[PDB]
């Protein structure tokens, strides 16, 4: 029977319009962890203008295992955008668990198109803030 440890994190990115126009910016959250004394530290990373030219039209969003004393940790993950009413928008999940090691990330290079994100009719940048939710499911055995 797989053993699963779930934990979540809410990241508010303030001053979203002050993300750089030039390519290459990476913004990262504070670290977070489960309530367990597992010595795992995680964060989220966004490229507001993508990782490369193929993804230049998108925000890229990944889950990074920042610190880990074990050789690997397998985890499923899900990311969502909260809109101005607090509602779940444009969430996507990994479906399978991915193998993390310290310094390794997994996520979506084309998480959301900037044109959709910056369209005020979608209500995703209220008061110039982007709110991202992440649920992580660590699978042990």
């Amino acid at each position: 029977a797989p053993k699963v440890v779930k934990f979540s994190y809410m990241w508010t990115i303030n001053n979203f319009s002050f993300c750089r126009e030039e390519m290459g910016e990476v913004i990262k959250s504070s670290t977070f962890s489960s309530g367990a004394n597992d010595k795992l530290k995680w964060c989220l990373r966004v490229n507001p203008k993508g990782l490369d030219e193929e993804s230049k039209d998108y925000l890229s969003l990944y889950l990074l295992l920042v610190s880990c004393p074990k050789s690997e940790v397998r985890a499923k993950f899900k990311f969502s955008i909260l809109n101005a009413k607090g509602e779940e928008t444009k969430a996507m999940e990994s479906q399978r668990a991915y193998r993390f090691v310290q310094g390794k990330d997994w996520g979506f290079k084309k998480f959301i198109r900037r044109d959709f994100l910056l369209d005020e009719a979608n209500g995703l940048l209220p008061d110039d803030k982007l709110t991202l939710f992440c649920e992580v499911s660590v699978v042990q055995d």
Binding site: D57, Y62, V101, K104, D105, G107, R113
Partner: peptide, 15 residues
């Protein structure tokens, strides 16, 4: 193009 692409990748190759 597609508003979101639900395909997983990493920023690094290997582990």
């Amino acid at each position: 193009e597609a508003t979101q692409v639900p395909l997983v990748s990493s920023t690094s190759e290997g582990y």
